[PDB]
């Protein structure tokens, strides 16, 4: 469970890149005169890939649909792939790595690649709020303790 | 890297955008006929503004220099601004949020805006590599070890 401070488990990013991208403004010429009430659906897809010994590529395909009530405003779907060399210390320990912190690596890039297509599609600024999955997986691994407050009263 | 730690943190991305963009090649005609092998001198500078209580602008200046020796290939500077909500955590955890985690959000935006500007100046692709300020801050407070690639596949 890696109870002691040491950093037994080890991480090295080989590469990060989009393996699939798709933006769709189906009613684009019409959608700008329509009522701007974006009801944005969030849909997560997972893709596995092993490239070599200890070289594992985990991919997260994030889907963002925007609907103005009944009419679709746009769609933004980005399969954010990332080659990650992950080894040394397995089980729930490594599961917190590949299934929690590795998502947190790809997630800023998957956010931006969606936000870029929205901005290129001339729609208002759209950013999905940051979710720290890994901390809430430590909550189940061995709970969240260790309240630090290294404070510095000065301006 | 074995810590539990609380989340709490009242965080919401208010708005992300490029405050400043630039790309300079005054040697542009002369440099295109050169063999492409530049010494990429990076620069990382920090800026901010208080907009309200608990509403703070994180700006990170990303400046990429490229010099083929005495020949300057190009200069590129993108100052990626991002308004973020900060509350809940205080001290080194709040410092982790600002000095690593919040410009980590801004990293892919700054990155694409630089590599776009390079390709606008018709220089070959120069993509910024993933730098974990977060993991570098995980290094202090404790001991830092690292396991090697074991190389194991079985069926």
């Amino acid at each position: 469970m890696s109870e002691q401070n040491n950093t037994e488990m080890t991480f090295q990013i080989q590469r990060i890149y989009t393996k699939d991208i798709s933006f769709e403004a189906p009613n684009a010429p019409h959608v700008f005169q329509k009522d701007w009430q974006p009801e944005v659906k969030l849909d997560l897809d997972t893709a596995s890939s092993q490239l070599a010994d200890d070289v594992y590529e985990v991919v997260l395909r994030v889907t963002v649909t925007a609907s103005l009530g009944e009419e679709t405003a746009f769609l933004c779907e980005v399969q954010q792939g990332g080659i990650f060399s992950i080894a040394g210390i397995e089980g729930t320990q490594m599961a917190h790595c590949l299934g929690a912190y590795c998502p947190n690596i790809l997630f800023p890039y998957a956010r931006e690649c969606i936000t870029s297509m929205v901005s290129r599609g001339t729609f208002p600024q759209l950013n999905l709020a940051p979710v720290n999955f890994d901390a809430l997986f430590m909550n189940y691994l061995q709970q969240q303790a260790g309240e630090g407050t290294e404070e510095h009263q000065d301006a | 890297m074995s810590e539990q730690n609380n989340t709490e943190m009242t965080f919401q991305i208010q708005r992300i955008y490029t405050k400043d963009i630039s790309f300079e090649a005054p040697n542009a005609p002369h440099v295109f006929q050169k063999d492409w092998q530049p010494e990429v001198k990076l620069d990382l500078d920090t800026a901010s503004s208080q907009l309200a209580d608990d509403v703070y602008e994180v700006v990170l200046r990303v400046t990429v220099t490229a010099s083929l020796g005495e020949e300057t290939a190009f200069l590129c500077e993108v100052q990626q601004g991002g308004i973020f909500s900060i509350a809940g955590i205080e001290g080194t955890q709040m410092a982790h949020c600002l000095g690593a985690y919040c410009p980590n959000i801004l990293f892919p935006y700054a990155r694409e805006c630089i590599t776009s500007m390079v390709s606008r100046g018709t220089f070959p692709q120069l993509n910024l590599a993933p730098v974990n300020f977060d993991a570098l801050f995980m290094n202090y407070l404790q001991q830092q070890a690292g396991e090697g690639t074991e190389e194991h596949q079985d069926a």
């Binding site: 397995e90 590949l98 979710v131 | -």
Partner: peptide, 25 residues
């Protein structure tokens, strides 16, 4: 009087593509 902008939640599966990633509940 508070609101929150759109966000994700914990992945209700916790994907484990790598071998030996045993998750004993």
């Amino acid at each position: 009087m508070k609101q929150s902008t759109i966000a994700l939640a914990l992945l209700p599966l916790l994907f484990t593509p790598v071998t030996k990633a045993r998750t004993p509940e």
